[PDB]
Curated annotation (Swiss-Prot), chain A:
Major site of localization recorded for this protein: nucleus
Subcellular location: Nucleus
Residues annotated as domain Ubiquitin-like: 1-66
Pathway(s) of this molecule: Protein modification; protein ubiquitination
Primary role: SIII, also known as elongin, is a general transcription elongation factor that increases the RNA polymerase II transcription elongation past template-encoded arresting sites. Subunit A is transcriptionally active and its transcription activity is strongly enhanced by binding to the dimeric complex of the SIII regulatory subunits B and C (elongin BC complex). Core component of multiple cullin-2 and cullin-5-RING E3 ubiquitin-protein ligase complexes (ECS complexes), which mediate the ubiquitination of target proteins. By binding to BC-box motifs it seems to link target recruitment subunits, like VHL and members of the SOCS box family, to Cullin/RBX1 modules that activate E2 ubiquitination enzymes. Component the von Hippel-Lindau ubiquitination complex CBC(VHL).
Protein's UniProt name: Elongin-B
InterPro entries attached to this UniProt entry: ELOB, Ubiquitin-like_dom, Ubiquitin-like_domsf
Organism listed in the record: Homo sapiens (Human)
GO terms of molecular function: transcription corepressor binding; ubiquitin protein ligase binding
UniProtKB/Swiss-Prot annotation, chain B:
Location in or out of the cell: Cytoplasm; Nucleus
Record-given protein name: COP9 signalosome complex subunit 2
Subunit structure: Component of the CSN complex, composed of COPS1/GPS1, COPS2, COPS3, COPS4, COPS5, COPS6, COPS7 (COPS7A or COPS7B), COPS8 and COPS9 isoform 1. In the complex, it probably interacts directly with COPS1, COPS4, COPS5, COPS6 and COPS7 (COPS7A or COPS7B). Specifically interacts with the ligand binding domain of the thyroid receptor (TR). Does not require the presence of thyroid hormone for its interaction. Interacts with CUL1 and CUL2. Interacts with IRF8/ICSBP1 and with nuclear receptors NR2F1 and NR0B1. Interacts with NIF3L1.
Protein's organism: Homo sapiens
Stated family: Belongs to the CSN2 family.
Gene: COPS2
Described function: Essential component of the COP9 signalosome complex (CSN), a complex involved in various cellular and developmental processes. The CSN complex is an essential regulator of the ubiquitin (Ubl) conjugation pathway by mediating the deneddylation of the cullin subunits of SCF-type E3 ligase complexes, leading to decrease the Ubl ligase activity of SCF-type complexes such as SCF, CSA or DDB2. The complex is also involved in phosphorylation of p53/TP53, c-jun/JUN, IkappaBalpha/NFKBIA, ITPK1 and IRF8/ICSBP, possibly via its association with CK2 and PKD kinases.
Swiss-Prot record, chain C:
Keyword match Nucleus: yes
A GO molecular function held by the record: transcription corepressor binding
Name under which the protein is recorded: Elongin-C
Function in brief: SIII, also known as elongin, is a general transcription elongation factor that increases the RNA polymerase II transcription elongation past template-encoded arresting sites. Subunit A is transcriptionally active and its transcription activity is strongly enhanced by binding to the dimeric complex of the SIII regulatory subunits B and C (elongin BC complex).
One GO BP: target-directed miRNA degradation
Organism, as annotated: Homo sapiens
SUPFAM superfamilies to which the protein is assigned, alphabetical: POZ domain
Family: Belongs to the SKP1 family.
Curated annotation (Swiss-Prot), chain D:
Family: Belongs to the CSN1 family.
SMART domains: PINT (SM00088)
Keywords, alphabetical: Cytoplasm, Nucleus, Phosphoprotein, Signalosome
Protein name, UniProt field: COP9 signalosome complex subunit 1
Source superkingdom: Eukaryota
Modified residues (Phosphoserine): S432
Lineage summary: Eukaryota, Metazoa, Chordata, Craniata, Vertebrata
Role of this protein: Essential component of the COP9 signalosome complex (CSN), a complex involved in various cellular and developmental processes. The CSN complex is an essential regulator of the ubiquitin (Ubl) conjugation pathway by mediating the deneddylation of the cullin subunits of SCF-type E3 ligase complexes, leading to decrease the Ubl ligase activity of SCF-type complexes such as SCF, CSA or DDB2. The complex is also involved in phosphorylation of p53/TP53, c-jun/JUN, IkappaBalpha/NFKBIA, ITPK1 and IRF8/ICSBP, possibly via its association with CK2 and PKD kinases.
Places the protein is found: Cytoplasm; Nucleus
Length: 104, 51, 112, 433
């Protein structure tokens, strides 16, 4: 039923819970109370694509099999550095270290 | 605990039993028998008690 | 489109509603407060340190856990809390061979 | 076989969701006469709350019954739905309209659920879980329906909230073939309300609570081939619920419990269970064809009790769950009637038994072979005179020899145990591998 998403922006993930087919404007109000920023400055993206305020999460592609609690989906974040978007690309996680060869 | 002879709640249910027995409807006679136990615990021994 | 939404609802909270977890590569893992109560070392930091339990400055510094290890730890906290107090299907958790050897050492440290 | 005489109004108004569609498709695939009315009523249910998984499967069977000339449905449909009634067809602009309308209803219910959680109201959250659980069933999300009912368990505060929640998990566990989960949930729903409230639902009762908990468990016990446990719980339910919106019909509990106890109980046990109990008398009075079976079985009337069994077999085969049980329950009732009939006899004639069961001499000889190996009797077939004789051994022969064989194994196993304990004394363990 419930789906979990992560808002990553320049090596900074934000774990925020939302509904399956909820409005996009409702998700921006939750980040306002944690970042002390107006919701009009944030911009949610999905696979390098600008979303709309009139649409919902269920119409884009936020299903139960995709945004599972065990493996959430990456959500883009873009602020307002001047008048347009700011961030767009993030950085992946690090690589695992060398495994001990004495155990294999 | 004074005078008796005067029951209305049990007289209505007793009149339906004499009518439903002619139509052979055991589904309604079983429901009317359970409702007669509450009134039987508050009446002496008149004539409706034997019906 | 349709449907009535709530402006100040859901899981909206101040600085005391979400915690902060500092990784070893510079990543900042900000999760909920109820999800960090599964472990033992993280829960001990919120009860202390210290005579100030709540001060809008709660943070977790992990110098031994990098970024790829804490990425599965935060997902394991949500998987453990959500899949309780119910009776539904529980899918299998995808665990990599290179991560299983690292997740075992982190589970014993976090007491989970 | 199939039966053209069957009431489809009561069989479709008893269940809802996926059970109403599956029960109607099995009738059309088995009965050629009841195929147009079965597919028409099933297509009308797709209009309310549209979907995309159950709208393309129903139309697949309609095109194979009207366009194909191999079936009898050709002179009336003429390979076109324009024949008397106008069922919903399937075109290009219909596969897209049935998907956009279903997704619009999901976004409206999901948005309202987030607002109810922010108001800190446990009554609005529990009410919204029932609407989301039944919506994902008709669409095709079998895993999303169990996630909505499982979250409503923490918002209970009364006895009616636990009963309404436990009844929803049974509907999802039926499609998943989880018979063990149904038996584990009916026990929890019986200890909280203490069996029909704490006083019996005031004085008069219109919809009994015990009947709901006793009817949902009978469907899972029948599919698991458990006729002994299903016939012992269906007798406690009474006819006081007036049909069901999402459960079995009241005209099927008398057959489910009447046919299960007829194969596991004899004649003496039937007069004390399905006859002495006043709760099962209300269910048997609705269908007089089932009450005459018990009376004919007690009066040693196996000739008339067998002819009435095959007459109702064509009507029970049109069902979905009772259809696969016509080959396991019918063979046990016929075998039980033959054992009880041969108990007072000891030298029955083959010519008299063949004329009583409406059979012949050739079919009667084959029935005696399957009655000795499978049954618990002891008869002998004498082919020299065509008379079922009886030749049993002495009571002292099968008792002295059985006790002597057990005494020899008792002394052999006791002496062999001393040999195993002998090597365990001088420090000699296992050294073979």
């Amino acid at each position: 039923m419930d789906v979990f998403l992560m808002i990553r922006r320049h090596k900074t993930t934000i774990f925020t819970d939302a509904k399956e087919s909820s409005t996009v404007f409702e998700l921006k109000r939750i980040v306002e109370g944690i970042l002390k920023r107006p919701p009009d400055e944030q911009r949610l993206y999905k696979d390098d694509q600008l979303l709309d305020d009139g649409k919902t999460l269920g119409e884009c592609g936020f299903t139960s099999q995709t945004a599972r609690p065990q493996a959430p989906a990456t959500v883009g974040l873009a602020f307002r550095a001047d008048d347009t978007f700011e961030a767009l690309c993030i950085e992946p996680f690090s690589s695992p270290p060398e495994l001990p060869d004495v155990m294999k | 605990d004074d005078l008796k002879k005067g029951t209305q709640l049990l007289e209505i249910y007793a009149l339906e039993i004499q009518m439903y027995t002619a139509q052979k409807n055991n589904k309604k006679l079983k429901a009317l028998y359970e409702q007669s136990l509450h009134i039987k615990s508050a009446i002496p021994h008149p004539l409706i008690m034997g019906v | 489109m349709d449907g009535e939404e709530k402006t100040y609802g859901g899981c909206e909270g101040p600085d005391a509603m979400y915690v902060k977890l500092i990784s070893s590569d510079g990543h900042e893992f900000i999760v909920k407060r109820e999800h960090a109560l599964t472990s033992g070392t993280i829960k001990a930091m919120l009860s202390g340190p210290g005579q100030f339990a709540e001060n809008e400055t709660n943070e977790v510094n992990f110098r031994e856990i990098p970024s790829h290890v804490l990425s599965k730890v935060c997902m394991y906290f949500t998987y453990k809390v959500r899949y309780t107090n119910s009776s539904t299907e529980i899918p299998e958790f995808p665990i990599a061979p290179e991560i299983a050897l690292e997740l075992l050492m982190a589970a014993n440290f976090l007491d989970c | 076989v199939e039966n053209p005489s069957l009431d489809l109004e009561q069989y479709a108004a008893s269940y809802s969701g996926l059970m109403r569609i599956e029960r109607l498709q099995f009738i059309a695939d088995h009965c050629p006469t009841l195929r147009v009315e079965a597919l028409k009523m099933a297509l009308s249910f797709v209009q309310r709350t549209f979907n995309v998984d159950m709208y393309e499967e129903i139309h697949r069977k309609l095109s194979e019954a009207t366009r194909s000339s191999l079936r009898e449905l050709q002179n009336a449909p003429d390979a076109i739905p324009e024949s008397g009634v106008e069922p919903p067809a399937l075109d290009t602009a219909w596969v897209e309209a049935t998907r956009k309308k279903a997704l619009l209803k999901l976004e409206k219910l999901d948005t309202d659920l987030k607002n109810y959680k922010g108001n800190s109201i446990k009554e609005s959250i529990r009410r919204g879980h029932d609407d989301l659980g039944d919506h994902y069933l008709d669409c095709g999300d079998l895993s999303n329906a169990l996630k909505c009912y499982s979250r409503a368990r923490d918002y209970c505060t009364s006895a009616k909230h636990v009963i309404n929640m436990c009844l929803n998990v049974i509907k999802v566990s039926v499609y998943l073939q989880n018979w063990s989960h149904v038996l584990s949930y009916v026990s929890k729903a019986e200890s909280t309300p203490e069996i029909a409230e704490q006083r019996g639902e005031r004085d008069s009762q219109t919809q009994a609570i015990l009947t709901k908990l006793k009817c949902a468990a009978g469907l899972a016990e029948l599919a698991a081939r458990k006729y002994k446990q299903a016939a012992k719980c269906l007798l406690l339910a009474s006819f006081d619920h007036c049909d069901f919106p999402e459960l079995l019909s009241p005209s099927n509990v008398a057959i489910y419990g009447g046919l299960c106890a007829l194969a596991t109980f004899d004649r003496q046990e039937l007069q004390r269970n399905v006859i002495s109990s006043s709760s099962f008398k209300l269910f048997l009075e609705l269908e007089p064809q089932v009450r005459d079976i018990i009376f004919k079985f007690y009066e040693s009337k196996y000739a008339s009790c067998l002819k009435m069994l095959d007459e109702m077999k064509d009507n029970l085969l049109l069902d979905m769950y009772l259809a696969p049980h016509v080959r396991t329950l019918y063979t046990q009732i016929r075998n039980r009637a033959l054992i009880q009939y041969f108990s007072p006899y000891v030298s029955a004639d083959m010519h008299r038994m063949a004329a009583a069961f409406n059979t012949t001499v050739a079919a009667l000889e084959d029935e005696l072979t399957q009655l000795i190996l499978e049954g618990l009797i002891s008869a002998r077939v004498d082919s020299h005179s065509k008379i079922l004789y009886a030749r049993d051994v002495d009571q002292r022969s099968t008792t002295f020899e059985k006790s002597l064989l057990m005494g020899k194994e008792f002394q052999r196993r006791a002496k062999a145990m001393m040999l195993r304990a002998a090597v365990l004394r001088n420090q000699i363990h296992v050294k073979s591998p």
